[PDB]
Amino acid sequence: SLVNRKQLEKMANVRFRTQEDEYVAILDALEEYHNMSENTVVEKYLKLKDINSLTDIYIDTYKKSGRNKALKKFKEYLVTEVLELKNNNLTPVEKNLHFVWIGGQINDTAINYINQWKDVNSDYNVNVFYDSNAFLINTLKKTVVESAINDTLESFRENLNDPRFDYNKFFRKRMEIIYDKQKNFINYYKAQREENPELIIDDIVKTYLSNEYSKEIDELNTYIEESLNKITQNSGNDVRNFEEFKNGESFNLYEQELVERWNLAAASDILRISALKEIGGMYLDVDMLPGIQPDLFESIEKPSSVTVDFWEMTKLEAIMKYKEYIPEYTSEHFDMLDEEVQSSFESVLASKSDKSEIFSSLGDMEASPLEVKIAFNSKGIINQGLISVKDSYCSNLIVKQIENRYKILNNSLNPAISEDNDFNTTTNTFIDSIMAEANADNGRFMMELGKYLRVGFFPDVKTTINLSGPEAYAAAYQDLLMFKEGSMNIHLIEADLRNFEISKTNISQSTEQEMASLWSFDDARAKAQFEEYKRNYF
């Protein structure tokens, strides 16, 4: 239990000192808190936050007071009480599974993974959010990028052995022309939406592709038709009917990533947490699979010669090898096992008859109305999996985190692009404003924001992480545990964040597709990629 009024008066007692107005404010607030056993969890949290805020104002008011030590310990006590509130007051999690595939056609292996979730979760409603107006964004990005690569490679022309025409110069010029093409497109798009507001993204993109890159409108209509057909046959849920999202203050951010930057990952980041906040349930990336039944392989000890991750991949590859639920799944790891272990897998799996003996079911999940739960990998939290009751407190904190970081980004970015200038001068105005607005609390973050316009077209850019990805989740967690909003500099350690992990049993993250998805544009692959562009062009 949290300390009561008398107990804090004893902790925070200083002889011959009268009780100040602020102090009485703290003690009254604590007394009121212990009289809310019949209030909602959120209400109790808010009272704990009002308490913490009052305690801070007292500490700031009487800086060298003798009560500050006890009151600081009381702050710690408040954080612990919040953890107890989150842990001892659970609610049902709405039985929804949320996936996102936007900007193009969904491939067969994604639908195979989703189908696994469907098969062992018949009681859960499944949403695969898509954007029916924007099936061509990825196509636009691919063709603009390919055109930039050709322009740059021609730009090198004869001097290929000139050492100062290296991959760095290649990517700096390629970025320049990509930026020109991108702002050309954004201008045409805003012109069209002014001239004919009836038009949707794909009309504008299709006629743009026809005019500027000689693509065939008929082929693009076929591509749209087939993509729409495939996703609607697989639980498609159109984001253009997501009214709460369309009318909220994150929709313009979603469309910024979608149509201005062509970053389908950033847009999926924006959307998944709004979906979660409005509907509740569990969000998954399409390369995640259901958790394996815990006892399924209890009889097979993991050798010491293989890492934990190796063994996880092995389990899945065995299941797919002898049950064939997903065709063409890899066996790279399973095949490296000694013959005896291989047969242990084969026999355990021949023992089992129905997929429900291999994959577990989510069932009836419950969570705190304060929290959203996130997955973990060896590098920390990752939002490939999230669990939340509808309108949870943390889902609001995460939405606010993302909207505020975009506020900071766009406050400096929008003035620079408003002047029609090239990539380099635009970057200079933009970065100048960033550094002007930097301070100790947001320094690291701003250094990341600096690379915004290069996201997706340059090696070693980590802006999305800081803008819409895991950093905003960690920032929201800190907001909760600090009784504030707007954290920019994360000091929570892994033990703090573990208070929000999804049980390992609810997701299989070690899949073939996700190890594929784990590649980074690391500036060695940039070198290699340059080498197969000049090898593929000459």
**Residue 517 marked as a ligand binder:** yes
| 286 annotated as a binding-site residue | yes
d(CA 95, CA 92): 9
Distance CA 183, CA 197 (A): 20
Nearer residue to Mn ion within complex by CB, 371 or 514: 514
Restricting to residues 275-314, name those near Mn ion by CB under 5 A. 285, 287
Q: How far is the CB of 285 from Mn ion (least distance, A)?
A: 5
CA–CA separation, 370 vs 85, rounded Å? 9
**Which of these segments, 5-13, 85-93, 445-453, 516-524, binds Mn ion (CB under 5 A)?**
516-524
Tokens 């959203």 belong to: 372
Q: How far is the CB of 521 from Mn ion (least distance, A)?
A: 15
Return the number of the residue (113 or 171) whose C-beta is nearest Mn ion: 113
Applying the rule CB under 5 A, the residues between 377 and 396 that interact with Mn ion are: 384
Q: In a 3-state reduction of DSSP, which class is residue 367? A: strand
Query: Is the dihedral angle over the CA atoms 366, 367, 368, 369 positive or is it negative?
Result: negative
Query: Nearer Cβ to Mn ion, position 288 or 402?
Result: 288
Binding mask 43-82 for Mn ion (x = CB under 5 A): ----------------------------------------
Binding residue for Mn ion (CB under 5 A) from 80, 229, 517, 536? Answer: 517
Separation of alpha carbons 92 and 364, rounded Å: 7
CA atoms within 13 A on the CB side of 308: 5
State the minimum distance, in angstroms, from the CB of residue 53 to Mn ion.
39
CA–CA dist 392, 78 (Å, integer): 20
b/e map 222-241, b = 16+ CB within 10 Å: ebbeebbebbeebbbbebee
Shortest Cβ distance from residue 288 to Mn ion (Å)? 7
- Please indicate if the annotation marks 166 as binding a ligand: no
Whichever of 81 and 514 has its CB closer to Mn ion, that residue is: 514
Euclidean distance between CA atoms 47 and 50, whole angstroms = 5
Tell me the CA distances in angstroms from 176 to 32, 172, 179, 421, one per residue in order.
Answer: 61, 6, 5, 11
Q: Which of 316, 514, 530, 533 binds Mn ion (CB under 5 A)?
A: 514
Taking contact as CB under 5 A, which single stretch among the options 51-59, 202-210, 481-489, 514-522 is the one that binds Mn ion?
Answer: 514-522
Pick 287 or 471: Cβ nearer Mn ion: 287
Distance of CA 92 to the CA centre of its chain: 23
Shorter beta-carbon distance to Mn ion: residue 299 or 517 = 517
Residue 19 has what DSSP assignment? Answer: P
Q: How many residues does the chain have?
A: 538
| Least Å from the CB of residue 274 to Mn ion | 20
Residue 138 marked as a ligand binder: yes
Rounded to a whole number of angstroms, the minimum distance from the CB of residue 382 to Mn ion is 8
Spatial distance between the Cα atoms of 362 and 355, rounded to a whole number of angstroms = 14
101 appears as a binding residue in the annotation? yes
Piece in contact with Mn ion (CB under 5 A), picked from 202-210, 265-273, 376-384, 478-486: 376-384
460 in helix, strand or coil?
Answer: coil
C-alpha to C-alpha distance for 482 and 77, rounded to whole angstroms: 12
- Work out how close the CB of 456 gets to Mn ion at its nearest, in angstroms, rounded to a whole number: 16
Residue showing the smallest CB distance to Mn ion in the complex: 517
- Residues numbered 470 to 489 that lie near Mn ion (CB under 5 A) are none
Asked if residue 404 belongs to a known ligand binding site, the reply is no
The two three-digit tokens of residue 90, written as one number: 């659970």
Q: Is 268 annotated as a binding residue?
A: yes
Shortest Å, Cβ 511 to Mn ion: 8
Residue 64 Cα to chain centre, angstroms: 43
Residue 408 is assigned to a ligand binding site: no
Secondary structure in 3-state letters for 468-529: CCHHHHHHHHHHHHCCCCCCCCCCCCHHHHHHHECCHHHCECCCHHHHHCCCCCCCCHHHHH
Q: How far is it, in rounded angstroms, from Cα 477 to Cα 374?
A: 11
Output 250 or 509, the one with its CB closest to Mn ion: 509
Helix (H) or strand (E) holding 46: helix 41-61
Does residue 269 bind Mn ion (CB under 5 A)? no
CB 265 to Mn ion: min, Å? 10
Smallest distance, Mn ion to C-beta of residue 122, A: 25
Closest separation between CB of residue 272 and Mn ion, Å? 12
Q: Cβ 347 to Mn ion, closest distance in Å?
A: 32
Q: Cβ closer to Mn ion: 52 or 508?
A: 508
DSSP characters over 65-106: -TTHHHHHHHHHHHHHHHHHHHHH--EEPPSEEEEE--SSPP
Number of residues that bind Mn ion (CB under 5 A): 5
Is 287 assigned a ligand-binding role in the annotation?
yes
Instruction: For residue 399, say whether it is annotated as part of any ligand binding site.
Output: no
Task: Say if CB 374 and CB 502 are below 8 A apart.
Answer: yes
The DSSP call for residue 334 is G
User: Which among 56-64, 433-441, 482-490, 513-521 is the span making contact with Mn ion, rule CB under 5 A?
Assistant: 513-521
Distances, alpha carbon 91 to alpha carbons 41, 48, 364, 388, 397, in Å: 10, 20, 10, 10, 19
Is 258 annotated as a binding-site member? no
Site string for Mn ion, 442-461 (x = CB under 5 A): --------------------
Nearer to Mn ion, 97 or 149 (CB): 97
Residue list for the binding site for Mg(2+): 285, 287, 514
Binding region: 100-102, 138, 268-272, 285-287, 514, 517-519
Which positions make up the binding site for Mn(2+)?
287, 514
Q: Which residues bind Mn ion (CB under 5 A)?
A: 285, 287, 384, 514, 517
Binding site for UDP-alpha-D-glucose: residue ranges?
100-102, 138, 268-272, 285-287, 517-519
